[PDB]
A paper describes a structure:
Upon obtaining pentamidine, we assayed the three bis-benzamidine compounds against mesotrypsin over multiple substrate and compound concentrations to determine the inhibition mode: competitive, non-competitive, or mixed inhibition. All three compounds exhibited a competitive inhibition mode of binding toward mesotrypsin (shown for diminazene in Fig 3), with inhibition constants (Ki) of 3.66, 5.10, and 10.57 μM for diminazene, pentamidine, and hydroxystilbamidine respectively. Diminazene bound to mesotrypsin most tightly while also being the least selective for the other trypsin isoforms, and was in turn selected as the best candidate compound for further investigation based on this profile. We set out to crystallize diminazene with mesotrypsin to gain a structural view of this candidate compound bound within the mesotrypsin active site. The diminazene-mesotrypsin complex crystallized in the P212121 space group having the unit cell dimensions of a = 40.92, b = 64.44, c = 80.68 and αβγ = 90°. Following refinement, well defined density was observed for the first benzamidine moiety of diminazene, which was observed to bind within the specificity pocket of mesotrypsin. In the present structure, nitrogen atoms NAA and NAC of diminazene display hydrogen bonding contacts with Asp-189 of the specificity pocket. The positioning of diminazene in the specificity pocket closely recapitulates the position predicted for the ligand by the docking screen, with a ligand RMSD of 0.614 Å. The second benzamidine moiety of the diminazene molecule exhibited diffuse density, which may be attributable to exposure to the solvent channel, permitting multiple ligand conformations. We anticipate the conformational disorder observed in diminazene could arise in part from cis-to-trans isomerization of the triazene linker. Although our high resolution crystal structure revealed the second benzamidine ring of diminazene to be poorly ordered within the mesotrypsin active site, the top ranking binding pose of this molecule from the virtual screen presented a conformational isomer with diminazene interaction at Arg-193.
[name]/Mesotrypsin is one of three tryptic digestive enzymes produced and secreted from the human pancreas. Unlike other trypsin isoforms, it possesses resistance to proteinaceous trypsin inhibitors. Additionally, mesotrypsin displays differential activity from the other two human trypsin isoforms, displaying reduced capability for activating pancreatic zymogens, reduced activation of protease activated receptors (PARs), and elevated proteolytic activity towards proteinaceous trypsin inhibitors. Mesotrypsin differs from other human trypsin family members at twenty-eight residues; Arg-193 is one of the most critical because it is located within the active site, at a position where almost all other trypsin and chymotrypsin family serine protease members possess a highly conserved glycine residue.
Author numbering: 16 to 34, 37 to 67, 69 to 125, 127 to 130, 132 to 184, 184A, 185 to 188, 188A, ...
Write the structure that this text describes.
């Protein structure tokens, strides 16, 4: 997250870190045993880290649980990032408590102009890279589809929407990928891509979670 602030500790209890030696992506806990992330974050083995604030120091609220199933959307396109979403089934359920808990799936799409909360342990620089120890947060609005499309002409599919600031300065970034965009208490987006981070006319592009609620339901039911 570029241009954000350090979140209050364990104030986003649905935020997870995907770890494969180091942190590499975010995710969102949607039930005791299931996480939503980006398909481009797939690896064959993933450890999910819940209850984190400082990802470098064991503070006492962490739960580390291996992924048992890692299921990309079957229409994920690895060139265009169309359908950039995946589900992770934990090998055992997380213990739900004040510091680890779920985020609701969305009941409607978010309107343009809605203020959302984006979070993660991704890069904090617009040129180069620096990764933080503590979870970062960003308050940002949903942009119109026309703004999204004008920012990335020919690249915005029907699974994508934009959130951010066309003037630049504040955005998600590398290793925020897979993590949440929450608007009015519902998971509306998955951090997906952009050109650079926090550049003018290059807002973040996010997967439209609302478009996948039925897919999530069905996939979970079939893998239970
Ligand atoms: N790399 N993944 C990535 C994630 C998000 C952005 C962005 N919002 N600018 C850019 C790149
Ligand atoms: Ca920690």
């Amino acid at each position: 997250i570029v241009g954000g602030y350090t979140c209050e500790e364990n104030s986003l209890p649905y935020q997870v870190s995907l770890n494969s030696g180091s942190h590499f992506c975010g995710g969102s806990l949607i039930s005791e045993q299931w996480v939503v992330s980006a398909a481009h974050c797939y690896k064959t083995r993933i450890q999910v880290r819940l209850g984190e604030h400082n990802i470098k120091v064991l503070e006492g609220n962490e739960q580390f649980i291996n992924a048992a199933k890692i299921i990309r959307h079957p229409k994920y396109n690895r060139d265009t990032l169309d359908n950039d979403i995946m589900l992770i089934k934990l090998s055992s359920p997380a213990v739900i408590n004040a510091r680890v808990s779920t985020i609701s799936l969305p009941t409607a799409p978010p309107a343009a102009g809605t203020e959302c909360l984006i979070s993660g342990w991704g890069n904090t620089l617009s040129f180069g890279a620096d990764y933080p120890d503590e979870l970062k947060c960003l308050d940002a609005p949903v942009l119109t589809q026309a703004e999204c499309k004008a920012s990335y002409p020919g690249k915005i599919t029907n699974s994508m929407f934009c959130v951010g600031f066309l003037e630049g300065g504040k955005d998600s970034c590398q290793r925020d990928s897979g993590g949440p965009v929450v608007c009015n208490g519902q998971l509306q987006g998955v951090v997906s891509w952009g050109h650079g981070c926090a550049w003018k006319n290059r807002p973040g592009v996010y997967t439209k979670v609302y478009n996948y609620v039925d897919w999530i339901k069905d996939t979970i039911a079939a893998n239970s």
